[PDB]
Ligand binder design. Structure first.
Ligand code: UMP
Ligand code: UMP
Lengths: 316, 316
């Protein structure tokens, strides 16, 4: 089936993954170096063996494509994936005059009441961002995140490069370019960031009228991260192919440190006892083509009939 | 055998590589996305099925490690690999008062006499670089090349980052870092360069006291390039492991566009009729450890008994 490579990756990390300590000490089973390919002409690689919220993938990718760095956009579509990076700033700011939220994460994971008070501050924070523009401009702007790395890479010359916008023209004018690459990795920014870009780099490749994309993921959470990661990029492959008037080829996923945190073992095992159902199909707006102006309604997933969602601790 | 993955890659590009036009129009048989791993604990991956000049690999890697960008260093060890990038500048300069060398390459490849006059200017140019410091400082300095990308990445702040020097300390202090990455890809420089870095990015990974390295090669010449490429990086894996006092693990080679130019078909076929002999061993200076101060004599290849060298047109 289409998602087999993912399942096979899990199987593998279980059989020959070696214990490797990580920054959160939640333990991992790792492997270094791996590659999975997906023939997009055969279906959209959204996992059928567990329900994956395609809506969170759409909004987030679009946010990236708009070159947006402000969380406000996400919260407008109830996407909270990035809420904590922003929340962190608010919490550690002199303007923050409230309860002690010393890295809320670990404490909310244990203290039942902390989770509640912490959850107030988050709901509150999100509210300010959504309604108060002066607040949003300040705390809702992550800054160095995919949207700006892809579309507004800063230069010493003082200006900014739209890596992705130039790359799409490259495919239109020079489809056989061996340089259709977009890097999210900037050495000078890398050491100050709370989380250096996991999805480090990607390359396009056109042959026979089909567009392919290879992604270099430096680090991956097999259970919780990879399912989304596969969907974001296969979707982008479709969007670019759409913009460029090309057929969709393969999405090649290359990993560095692929790992399974120890608290996801039961869940991934159960996941593996399930049988993949036929894959969904992606349909895109035929008329609208400037993918940078795209929006939710312009992209639709057909026939996604998954298995129930598997709950797991974000002890990640 | 150790080099089997390379041979298997050639086999593959021959069986399912599709014709894809390239910048030189010498035709290629391409594939997109591929990964080979090499267990360095089993031997040094220098091809035994054809003689590969290990000396050119040593000097070049060392040149990179010194953060050097001047060809003079290479010419001192009779390494001419980069001679043409420098030569180009001299040829297209107002100080150049001599014969018309309109992209010598293609014309020298055909015109027998051009090859001679062109060869005079190259021998001459190299001479000036080696003896004349004012000349060398000007025309012998490539500028944006691996040594400076690895060791002197320029920042908007005006200064310069030693990516590699910081990364080795990272392995010493935080061996389990999932961020031990060195990028050679700078978006703002990429469009002005005659040849954007082929070896785009690499990542280290430490587990069980063994050091591994994964390389992302955006484009590869199966016949002429890859043999060297495999040696440069597996060697670097050893050098860093040496500096850090770690065991050598695996060298993982990830490709984007792996290709065979059409004029290398007979040669690669003949290559494939040969049987790999046992692999060589690499021995490094035990006392000397600051790999940045290393030199030729500090590195030695033992037992490299290859097959004769296979000649091929650099119609690359
Ligand atoms: O889209 C994402 C975002 C994050 N991660 C994971 C990778 C690691 O599991 C952890 C980050 O750890 P570092 O690689 O930064 O050390 O989050 C993913 O798998 N996918
Ligand atoms: O160490 C090297 C240097 C160059 N090349 C090859 C890659 C391509 O065959 C050609 C460069 O073409 P572009 O990728 O820049 O388009 O040179 C290698 O394989 N190895």
């Amino acid at each position: 089936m289409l998602e087999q490579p993912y399942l096979d990756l899990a199987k593998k990390v279980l059989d020959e993954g070696h214990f490797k300590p990580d920054r959160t000490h939640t333990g991992t089973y790792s492997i270094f170096g791996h590659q999975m390919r997906f023939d997009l002409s055969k279906g959209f690689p959204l996992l059928t063996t567990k329900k994956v919220p395609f809506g969170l993938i759409k909004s987030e990718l679009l946010w990236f494509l708009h070159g947006d760095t402000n969380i406000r956009f996400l919260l407008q579509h109830r996407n909270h994936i990035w809420d904590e990076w922003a929340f962190e700033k608010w919490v550690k700011s002199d303007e923050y005059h409230g309860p002690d939220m010393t890295d809320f994460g670990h404490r909310s994971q244990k203290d039942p009441e902390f989770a509640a008070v912490y959850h107030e501050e988050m709901a509150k924070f999100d509210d300010r961002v959504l309604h108060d523009d002066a607040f949003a401009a300040k705390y809702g702007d992550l800054g160095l995140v995919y949207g700006s790395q892809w579309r507004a890479w800063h230069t010493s010359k003082g200006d900014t490069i739209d890596q992705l916008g130039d790359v799409i023209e490259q495919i239109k004018t020079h489809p056989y370019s061996r340089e259709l690459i977009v890097s999210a990795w900037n050495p000078e920014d890398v050491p100050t960031m709370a989380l250096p870009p996991c999805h480090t780099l990607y390359q396009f490749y056109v042959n026979d009228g089909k567009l392919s994309l290879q992604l270099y993921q430096r680090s991956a959470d097999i259970f919780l991260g990879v399912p989304f990661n596969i969907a974001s990029y296969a979707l982008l492959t479709h969007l670019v192919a759409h913009e460029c008037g090309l057929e969709v080829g393969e999405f090649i996923h290359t990993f560095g440190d692929a790992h399974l945190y120890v608290n996801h073992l039961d869940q991934i095992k159960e996941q593996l006892s399930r049988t993949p159902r036929p894959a969904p199909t992606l349909q895109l707006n035929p008329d609208k083509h400037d993918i940078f102006d795209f929006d939710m309604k312009d992209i639709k997933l057909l026939n996604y009939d998954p298995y129930p969602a598997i709950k797991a601790p974000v002890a990640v």
